Design a binder for this molecule. Structure first.
Ligand code: CL
Ligand code: CU
Length: 99
């Protein structure tokens, strides 16, 4: 599934921000507007056994170009909360349910 990063209206948002995928189904987060962005999973808000450092972009790496995306495949079932580092304080946060 594809998730857009930033709205054409200027929202610092993941679009969609709350969604579901099946275990093993990719998520591809692609720049749309408002970048730079990244995708970081909050290590306190993901299922047991998951290594946040394997599924997150490095806090320092940014998708700074119009055509860039970040792909991640989640397997462990449950909810994952994630955010964009530069825009976390502006509410650029999301939730995915892996079912
Ligand atoms: Cl992992
Ligand atoms: Cu952002």
């Amino acid at each position: 599934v594809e998730v857009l990063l930033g709205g054409d209206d200027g929202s610092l948002a993941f679009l969609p921000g709350d969604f579901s995928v099946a275990s093993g189904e990719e998520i591809v987060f692609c720049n749309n507007a408002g970048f730079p962005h990244n995708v970081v999973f909050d290590e306190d808000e993901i299922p047991s056994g998951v290594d946040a450092a394997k599924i997150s972009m490095s806090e320092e790496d940014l998708l700074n170009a119009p055509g860039e995306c970040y792909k991640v495949t989640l397997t462990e079932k449950g909810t994952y909360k994630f955010y964009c580092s530069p825009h976390q304080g502006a509410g650029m946060v999301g939730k995915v349910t892996v079912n």
